[PDB]
Specification:
The structure is cut from a larger assembly and holds chains A, B and C.
Chain A (H helix, E strand, L loop, with lengths): L6 H12 L4 H8 L9 H16 L21 H4 L1 H20 L6 H7 L2 H14 L17 H5 L3 H22 L4 H14 L2 H14 L6 H12 L7 H12 L4 H14 L6 H10 L8 H13 L3 H12 L5 H15 L14 H16 L7 H14 L4 H16 L3 H8 L6 H13 L4 H13 L6 H9 L16 H16 L2 H14 L4 H13 L3 H15 L5 H13 L3 H13 L11 H8 L2
Helix pairs in contact in A: 1-2, 3-5, 5-7, 7-9, 7-10, 9-10, 10-11, 10-12, 11-12, 12-13, 12-14, 14-16, 16-17, 16-18, 17-18, 18-19, 19-20, 20-21, 20-23, 21-23, 23-24, 24-26, 26-27, 27-28, 28-29, 29-30, 30-31
Chain B lengths: L10 H4 L31 H5 L3
Chain C lengths: L1 H10 L5 H14 L3 H11 L3 H15 L6 H19 L2 H11 L2 H11 L3 H7 L11 H14 L5 H17 L3 H12 L8 E4 L6 E3 L28 E3 L6 E3 H4 L15
Antiparallel strand pairs in C: 1-2, 3-4
Helix pairs in contact in C: 1-2, 4-5, 5-6, 7-8, 8-9, 9-10, 10-11
The chains are: A mainly alpha, B mainly alpha, C mainly alpha.
The complex binds zinc ion (2 copies).
Keywords (chain A): Repeat, TPR repeat
GO cellular component, one term (chain A): cilium
Family (chain A): Belongs to the TTC21 family.
Chain lengths: 609, 53, 265
């Protein structure tokens, strides 16, 4: 009826896109008369391109090629990113209208309001550049040869390098158009961190963490600082800033999570109560504990291996459903039901505990039902529940689930091997594959799949290097230097050390264990296995301090390290620090066997000249 | 101690209502506690609910 | 010595006892001794502002865990009922506030009772009670029970109001996602909703209708199932909380859902 008006076309394209009509919405947009006379007749022009970019924000593009079999170098890569072309045009239009109105001198309030939108536009541009979407490679050229497609693929990395250099271009105007823009500085911090200019990274993150209040995005920078400083251990000031951060806001649980995890890594865990209880006191009395707060406390107790209390706290954290922690808390609940003890899934079960394990699986499946099918990790936790079943026929089902995970990620032995050499996108499922292989009795392919997962996280390079490095920086591997909840690579290298112990080549096992220990002091299990390694070579001296650390970490809860550390001291020659250990064992576990006759009597014999 | 299996209050139920879509974002208003079978006196319970803290 | 102070002021006609009682009430509020305050009020015979001050902490309890808030309203109604015996607009507003948190408990536990048909009948009764309970709380249950019985129409209205609330809030929301997903994966047409006729003029009305659509006569609603009562033969009248229910459901319950009054025998 009235095709001049485009206000209606706006919500038309919006509704079409939101209902999944993609090509239809694109054709709706490109059909606009304004798309290639008051002041406002400028701005809505650009608006359509915005919407275009939005409906093409999630759309996977490819790198354009030439039909001869080569990449079309004369065809720009961002041409494939039609949304990037869209907002390239849009930002040019916005600066052109800025120069249009720079000589108008209208009512200044609209000038002031307009003065900030281009910042949003170019920041979204930079985000699209750094978060680019090169499509998965085609298969027709795979069905041609094994060298031509390889030589053709050698331009996609050029494409991403070009795009990120464009982003590094975008940063300056991004910050320059608005300094009050918290997101602009945040993105600038992230791209600077991707480049390597650590000085600028510190500037951006510090600026964000000052002026951003009333928003949680600060935490996204905060973790960055916590990885920025602890990348090389040169700075530990983040700690201080953290409490300073926590000085301003106590209710910022999402920062408190990284606080707890970094403290866990530094081994200074129990002091976290300083920040914790005041936050607990921050909430007014007579009110239910905040679900985030409950998740925080349960996370703490899980790091303290108080899994029975952590179960309750996490179940308190789930209420009410739909909260941002609800998926997280449910995932943690399933994890701790799967791994209640320090024994994780890839241990070997050497009657009575099998039935309790089955009951755990009942609880786990019952709780896993609550997680939506749309959630990606739901099927991974399904496969992990089937792992918990430990039925050797269910291993086939488990690997089927874990190898549908890769097909989800992309969106005979040949099928699993083609799932193998694909791009490493979902490390959780890859660890699931490794467990699948190991509990199937397979160790070579388990080593291969874990090796591919490790290669994704670049802690491969030190195994052979450290031998000749010590023969003639011991850099903490940058993968582990996160302090976020992603524990997957930690368990990955724990698994790898476990395998190496099983094959008994304890050198590189102790090596990677020392690597993660340098990364993390709270990994009590690794302390235990390192001490076991030292026992295997009878080097009780280092094992003694490691087991003391492990005893502190377990909070005296075990008798096993009782006999372990007591024997370690006793064969070490100085069990005067083992007598108190033995009595400490007897104080709670008054009937731990083999104590009263083996150790302190031999200690008295050793005390005699 | 025979009340640690509280999640059963949604276990055999949600199995028929969650298997399709992600409607969990809507069920925030559901109370964790159920309703029991006893007559509550007007005044005998206020002391025990205010004596928690 | 507040107990001595009030007696001293009363025996010396010190009419300023209101300020003294206000100071005592504020002091007990600061010391969070609601039990002492309500005992003082019931020994002093104060009813309406006493119930109001009880409800002041009642809503503060209600905003996180309201199973005590419904009890607070119940004994507030009991206090205003005892006001009648103490004697020898607000007459029914107190009962409205008390009954405002009646329906929600059994509306939520109807899923546990597995008879999901009455869940919608309960859920569509809190529309008039949007002031006491926020509509975002109730419309979630309304849409949920509309989905669980596979009916629509009312769910469209609930989702529309919920999404308008969300758009008011943002000026990334998942209730728009739920509304669009359900409306495109299912037919969004209202099912049969007129199944009860008016006892006066014979006009078929909604099961949740508070008044007739033709003759405009209010109907007393069932206290547990929520259906409007059309015949007084199957209507059971409670003599304590002054409420009505249906015989076929109240025979199962030995006590009233509101007051739990024991049956005299
Ligand atoms: Zn009528
Ligand atoms: Zn009654």
């Amino acid at each position: 009826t009235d095709p001049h008006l485009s206000i209606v076309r706006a919500d038309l394209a919006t509704l079409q896109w939101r209902l999944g009509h993609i090509e239809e919405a694109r054709e709706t947009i490109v059909a606009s008369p304004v798309y290639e006379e008051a002041v406002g007749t400028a701005i809505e022009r650009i608006n359509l391109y915005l919407l275009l970019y939005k409906v093409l924000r999630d759309q996977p593009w490819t790198v354009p090629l030439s039909e001869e079999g080569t990449a079309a170098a004369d065809s720009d890569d961002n041409h494939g990113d039609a949304a990037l072309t869209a907002l390239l045009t849009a930002r040019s239009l916005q600066r052109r209208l800025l120069e249009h109105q720079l000589r108008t001198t209208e009512a200044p309030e609209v000038i002031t309001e307009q003065r900030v939108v281009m910042s949003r536009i170019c920041t979204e541009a930079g985000a699209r550049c750094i978060y680019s979407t090169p499509a998965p490679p085609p298969f027709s050229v795979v069905m041609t040869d094994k060298k031509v497609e390889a030589a053709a693929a050698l331009a996609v990395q050029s494409a991403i390098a070009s795009r990120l250099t464009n982003a590094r271009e975008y940063l300056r105007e991004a910050i320059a158009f608005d300094e009050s823009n918290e997101r602009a500085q945040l993105e600038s911090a992230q791209l600077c961190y991707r480049t390597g200019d650590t000085e600028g990274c510190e500037q951006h993150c510090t600026t964000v963490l000052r002026m951003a209040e009333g928003s949680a995005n600060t935490a996204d920078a905060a973790i960055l600082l916590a990885n920025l400083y602890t990348e090389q251990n040169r700075d530990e000031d983040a700690r201080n800033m953290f409490e300073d951060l926590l000085r301003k806001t106590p209710q910022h649980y999402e920062a408190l999570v990284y606080y707890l995890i970094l403290l866990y890594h530094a081994g200074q865990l129990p002091e976290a109560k300083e920040a914790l209880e005041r936050a607990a006191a921050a909430v007014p009395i007579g009110q239910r504990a905040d679900p985030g707060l409950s998740y925080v406390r349960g996370l703490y107790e899980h790091l303290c291996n108080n899994n029975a209390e952590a179960l309750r706290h996490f179940n308190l954290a789930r209420l009410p459903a739909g909260n941002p922690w609800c998926t997280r808390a449910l995932v943690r609940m399933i994890r701790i039901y799967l791994v209640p003890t320090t024994q994780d899934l890839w241990v070997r079960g050497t009657t009575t505990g099998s039935t309790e394990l089955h009951d755990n699986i009942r609880h786990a499946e019952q709780l896993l039902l609550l997680l939506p099918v749309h959630s990606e990790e739901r099927r991974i936790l399904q496969a992990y529940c089937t792992m918990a079943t430990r039925r050797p026929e269910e291993l086939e089902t488990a690997l089927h689930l874990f190898l549908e995970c890769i097909v989800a990620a992309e969106t005979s032995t040949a099928t699993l091997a083609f799932a193998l050499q694909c791009k490493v996108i979902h490390p959780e499922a890859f660890l699931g594959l490794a467990i699948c292989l190991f509990i199937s009795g397979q160790e070579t392919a388990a080593r291969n799949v874990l090796a591919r997962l490790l290669e994704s996280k670049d802690i491969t390079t030190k195994m052979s290097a450290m031998k000749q490095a010590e023969d003639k920086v011991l850099s903490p591997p940058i993968a582990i230097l996160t302090c976020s909840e992603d524990d997957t690579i930690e368990r990955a290298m724990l698994f790898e050390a476990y395998m190496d112990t099983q094959e008994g080549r304890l050198k590189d096992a102790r090596f990677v264990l020392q690597q993660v220990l340098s990364a993390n002091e709270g990994c009590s299990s690794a302390w235990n296995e390192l001490g076991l390694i030292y026992e295997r070579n009878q080097k009780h001296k280092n094992a003694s301090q490691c087991y003391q650390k492990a005893w502190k970490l377990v909070q005296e809860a075990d008798p096993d390290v009782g006999y372990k550390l007591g024997f370690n001291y006793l064969r070490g020659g100085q069990p005067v620090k083992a007598i108190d250990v033995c009595k400490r064992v007897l104080t709670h576990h008054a009937t731990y066997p083999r104590i009263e006759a083996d150790i302190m009597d031999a200690a008295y014999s050793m005390l005699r000249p | 101690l025979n009340e640690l299996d509280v999640a059963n209050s949604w276990d055999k139920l949600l199995r028929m209502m969650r298997s399709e879509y992600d409607m969990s974002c809507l069920t925030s208003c559901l109370a964790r506690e159920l309703d029991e079978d006893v007559a509550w006196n007007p005044e005998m319970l206020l002391v025990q609910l205010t004596s928690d803290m | 010595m507040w107990n001595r102070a009030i007696a001293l002021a009363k025996e010396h006609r010190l009419e300023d006892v209101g300020q003294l009682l206000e100071k005592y009430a504020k002091y007990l509020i600061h010391r969070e001794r609601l039990t002492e305050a309500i005992e003082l009020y019931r020994k002093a015979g104060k009813h309406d502002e006493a119930a109001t001050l009880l409800a002041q902490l009642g809503k503060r309890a209600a905003l996180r865990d309201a199973l005590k808030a419904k009890k607070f309203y119940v004994l507030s109604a009991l206090e205003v009922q005892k006001y009648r015996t103490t004697a020898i607009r607000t007459l029914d507003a107190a009962w409205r506030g008390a009954e405002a948190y009646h329906f929600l408990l059994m509306c939520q536990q109807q899923m546990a009772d597995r008879n999901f048909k009455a869940a919608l009948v309960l859920a569509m009764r809190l529309i008039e009670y949007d002031d006491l309970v926020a509509p975002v709380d109730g419309y979630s249950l309304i849409a949920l029970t509309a989905y669980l019985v596979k009916n629509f129409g009312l769910c469209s209205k609930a989702f529309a109001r919920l999404e308008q609330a969300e758009r008011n809030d943002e000026a990334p929301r998942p209730f728009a996602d739920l509304a669009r997903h359900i409306f495109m994966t299912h037919s969004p047409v209202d099912t049969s909703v007129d199944s009860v006729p008016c006892p006066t003029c014979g006009s078929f009305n909604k099961e949740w209708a508070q008044r007739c659509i033709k003759c405009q006569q209010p109907f007393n609603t069932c206290i547990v199932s929520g259906c409007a009562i059309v015949s007084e033969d199957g209507a059971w009248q409670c003599s304590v909380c002054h409420r009505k229910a249906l015989e076929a459901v109240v025979d199962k319950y030995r006590n009233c859902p509101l007051c739990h009054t024991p049956r005299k025998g």
